[PDB]
Design a protein around this motif. Structure first.
Motif, PDB file in Angstrom:
ATOM      1  N   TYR A  21      40.722  14.437  24.935  1.00 56.11           N
ATOM      2  CA  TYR A  21      40.555  15.804  24.470  1.00 56.11           C
ATOM      3  C   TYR A  21      41.449  16.684  25.317  1.00 56.11           C
ATOM      4  O   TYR A  21      41.763  16.328  26.454  1.00 56.11           O
ATOM      5  CB  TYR A  21      39.100  16.260  24.590  1.00 56.11           C
ATOM      6  N   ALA A  22      41.857  17.823  24.779  1.00 56.06           N
ATOM      7  CA  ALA A  22      42.670  18.767  25.527  1.00 56.06           C
ATOM      8  C   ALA A  22      42.505  20.156  24.948  1.00 56.06           C
ATOM      9  O   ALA A  22      42.662  20.357  23.743  1.00 56.06           O
ATOM     10  CB  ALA A  22      44.139  18.375  25.514  1.00 56.06           C
ATOM     11  N   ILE A  23      42.201  21.108  25.813  1.00 55.37           N
ATOM     12  CA  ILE A  23      41.882  22.464  25.413  1.00 55.37           C
ATOM     13  C   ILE A  23      42.899  23.392  26.047  1.00 55.37           C
ATOM     14  O   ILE A  23      43.078  23.383  27.269  1.00 55.37           O
ATOM     15  CB  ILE A  23      40.456  22.844  25.833  1.00 55.37           C
ATOM     16  N   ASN A  24      43.572  24.180  25.222  1.00 60.07           N
ATOM     17  CA  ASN A  24      44.510  25.186  25.690  1.00 60.07           C
ATOM     18  C   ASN A  24      43.799  26.525  25.687  1.00 60.07           C
ATOM     19  O   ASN A  24      43.674  27.166  24.639  1.00 60.07           O
ATOM     20  CB  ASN A  24      45.752  25.238  24.807  1.00 60.07           C
ATOM     21  N   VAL A  25      43.315  26.937  26.849  1.00 59.71           N
ATOM     22  CA  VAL A  25      42.756  28.268  27.015  1.00 59.71           C
ATOM     23  C   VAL A  25      43.560  29.023  28.055  1.00 59.71           C
ATOM     24  O   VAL A  25      44.233  28.437  28.907  1.00 59.71           O
ATOM     25  CB  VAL A  25      41.272  28.253  27.408  1.00 59.71           C
ATOM     26  N   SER A  26      43.500  30.340  27.953  1.00 64.41           N
ATOM     27  CA  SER A  26      44.101  31.245  28.912  1.00 64.41           C
ATOM     28  C   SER A  26      43.244  32.497  28.925  1.00 64.41           C
ATOM     29  O   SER A  26      43.147  33.195  27.914  1.00 64.41           O
ATOM     30  CB  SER A  26      45.543  31.577  28.531  1.00 64.41           C
ATOM     31  N   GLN A  27      42.595  32.766  30.048  1.00 69.67           N
ATOM     32  CA  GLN A  27      41.657  33.870  30.140  1.00 69.67           C
ATOM     33  C   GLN A  27      42.426  35.163  30.340  1.00 69.67           C
ATOM     34  O   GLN A  27      43.624  35.138  30.636  1.00 69.67           O
ATOM     35  CB  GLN A  27      40.664  33.655  31.280  1.00 69.67           C
ATOM     36  N   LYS A  28      41.737  36.281  30.149  1.00 68.93           N
ATOM     37  CA  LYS A  28      42.298  37.586  30.446  1.00 68.93           C
ATOM     38  C   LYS A  28      42.556  37.704  31.940  1.00 68.93           C
ATOM     39  O   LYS A  28      41.837  37.124  32.755  1.00 68.93           O
ATOM     40  CB  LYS A  28      41.331  38.673  29.973  1.00 68.93           C
ATOM     41  N   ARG A  29      43.599  38.443  32.295  1.00 66.29           N
ATOM     42  CA  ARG A  29      43.993  38.565  33.690  1.00 66.29           C
ATOM     43  C   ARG A  29      43.089  39.542  34.431  1.00 66.29           C
ATOM     44  O   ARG A  29      43.110  40.748  34.173  1.00 66.29           O
ATOM     45  CB  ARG A  29      45.439  39.035  33.777  1.00 66.29           C
ATOM     46  N   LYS A  30      42.303  39.023  35.369  1.00 66.25           N
ATOM     47  CA  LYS A  30      41.444  39.855  36.195  1.00 66.25           C
ATOM     48  C   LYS A  30      42.268  40.440  37.328  1.00 66.25           C
ATOM     49  O   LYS A  30      42.480  39.782  38.348  1.00 66.25           O
ATOM     50  CB  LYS A  30      40.277  39.068  36.783  1.00 66.25           C
ATOM     51  N   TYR A  31      42.720  41.670  37.154  1.00 63.31           N
ATOM     52  CA  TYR A  31      43.483  42.367  38.175  1.00 63.31           C
ATOM     53  C   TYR A  31      42.505  43.101  39.073  1.00 63.31           C
ATOM     54  O   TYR A  31      41.311  43.155  38.770  1.00 63.31           O
ATOM     55  CB  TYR A  31      44.476  43.344  37.549  1.00 63.31           C
ATOM     56  N   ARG A  32      43.001  43.650  40.175  1.00 64.58           N
ATOM     57  CA  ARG A  32      42.141  44.396  41.077  1.00 64.58           C
ATOM     58  C   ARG A  32      42.450  45.882  40.991  1.00 64.58           C
ATOM     59  O   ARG A  32      43.428  46.291  40.367  1.00 64.58           O
ATOM     60  CB  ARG A  32      42.317  43.880  42.498  1.00 64.58           C
ATOM     61  N   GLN A  33      41.597  46.695  41.602  1.00 66.64           N
ATOM     62  CA  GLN A  33      41.715  48.137  41.445  1.00 66.64           C
ATOM     63  C   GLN A  33      42.209  48.777  42.734  1.00 66.64           C
ATOM     64  O   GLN A  33      41.803  48.389  43.829  1.00 66.64           O
ATOM     65  CB  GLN A  33      40.374  48.726  41.023  1.00 66.64           C
ATOM     66  N   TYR A  34      43.113  49.749  42.600  1.00 63.82           N
ATOM     67  CA  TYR A  34      43.740  50.355  43.761  1.00 63.82           C
ATOM     68  C   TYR A  34      43.481  51.851  43.799  1.00 63.82           C
ATOM     69  O   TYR A  34      43.234  52.417  44.866  1.00 63.82           O
ATOM     70  CB  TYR A  34      45.248  50.111  43.764  1.00 63.82           C
ATOM     71  N   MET A  35      43.556  52.507  42.650  1.00 63.24           N
ATOM     72  CA  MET A  35      43.465  53.957  42.613  1.00 63.24           C
ATOM     73  C   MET A  35      42.056  54.391  42.245  1.00 63.24           C
ATOM     74  O   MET A  35      41.468  53.847  41.306  1.00 63.24           O
ATOM     75  CB  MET A  35      44.465  54.532  41.609  1.00 63.24           C
ATOM     76  N   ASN A  36      41.529  55.373  42.991  1.00 59.18           N
ATOM     77  CA  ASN A  36      40.255  56.043  42.696  1.00 59.18           C
ATOM     78  C   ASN A  36      39.090  55.057  42.629  1.00 59.18           C
ATOM     79  O   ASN A  36      38.512  54.821  41.568  1.00 59.18           O
ATOM     80  CB  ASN A  36      40.349  56.872  41.415  1.00 59.18           C
ATOM     81  N   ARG A  37      38.772  54.446  43.770  1.00 59.79           N
ATOM     82  CA  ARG A  37      37.846  53.321  43.770  1.00 59.79           C
ATOM     83  C   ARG A  37      36.458  53.730  44.236  1.00 59.79           C
ATOM     84  O   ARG A  37      35.453  53.199  43.743  1.00 59.79           O
ATOM     85  CB  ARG A  37      38.381  52.222  44.678  1.00 59.79           C
ATOM     86  N   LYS A  38      36.397  54.641  45.212  1.00 62.28           N
ATOM     87  CA  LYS A  38      35.291  55.100  46.074  1.00 62.28           C
ATOM     88  C   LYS A  38      34.936  54.075  47.149  1.00 62.28           C
ATOM     89  O   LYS A  38      34.167  54.414  48.046  1.00 62.28           O
ATOM     90  CB  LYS A  38      33.987  55.459  45.332  1.00 62.28           C
TER      91      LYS A  38
END
Length: 45
Positions: A21-38
Motif C-alpha cells: 500500500y502507498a498513500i500520498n498525503v501532504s498536510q497543510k503547512r503549520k507555520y509559526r506566528q511572529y507579529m502581534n502574539r501577546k
RNA sequence: AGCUUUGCGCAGUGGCAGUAUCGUAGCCAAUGAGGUUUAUCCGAGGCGCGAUUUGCUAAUUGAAAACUUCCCAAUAGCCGUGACGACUAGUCGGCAUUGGCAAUUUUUGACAGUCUCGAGACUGG
C-alpha cells in the motif's frame, strides 16, 4: 516433493509484495506566528 | 362632447454623448451676435476661460482592502491471544487488544457486449 494438499490463502497472510500500500498525503503547512502574539519572544512549538 | 396646435413640466420606450453636453461670476449681444450663397439680403447667441453627481457589483495587488485565528491530548466484523464467568482437557457468553483477513463455499466480483417474441439464443477468434 512438489511442496500436496491444494492451498487457498484466504485469511492467511500472503508471502511478499502483495501487501503493498502507498498513500500520498501532504498536510497543510503549520507555520509559526511572529507579529502581534501577546506571547513571549521565542516561538511556540 | 370629441379632435387638435403651441410652450412648459413629469414619467416611459429608444437613440446619442469629447467637433458632445454645459457653467461663465470676464466682456460683447436684437439700441444687432455672426455672415464668402441671394447683400437695400439674412437674424442668434458669440469670443475667451473653465469643466464634465450618486448607488450597486466584479476583479487585482496587499499580511491586513476595515460593520463591533491556529495547535496539542483524549472520547464519540471475524479468526488468535488474556482474564473473568458459566457449563461438562472440552464447550459456551460477554469483555479486552500486543498478529492476520484479494487464490474454489461467501466480503475484493464470470462479467461485459449482441439479437428475438415476462422468456430464450449468440459472441468474447
Amino acid at each position: 516433493k512438489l511442496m500436496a494438499s491444494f492451498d487457498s490463502t484466504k485469511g492467511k497472510k500472503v508471502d511478499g509484495s502483495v501487501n503493498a500500500y502507498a498513500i500520498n498525503v501532504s498536510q497543510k503547512r503549520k507555520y509559526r506566528q511572529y507579529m502581534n502574539r501577546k506571547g513571549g519572544f521565542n516561538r511556540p512549538l
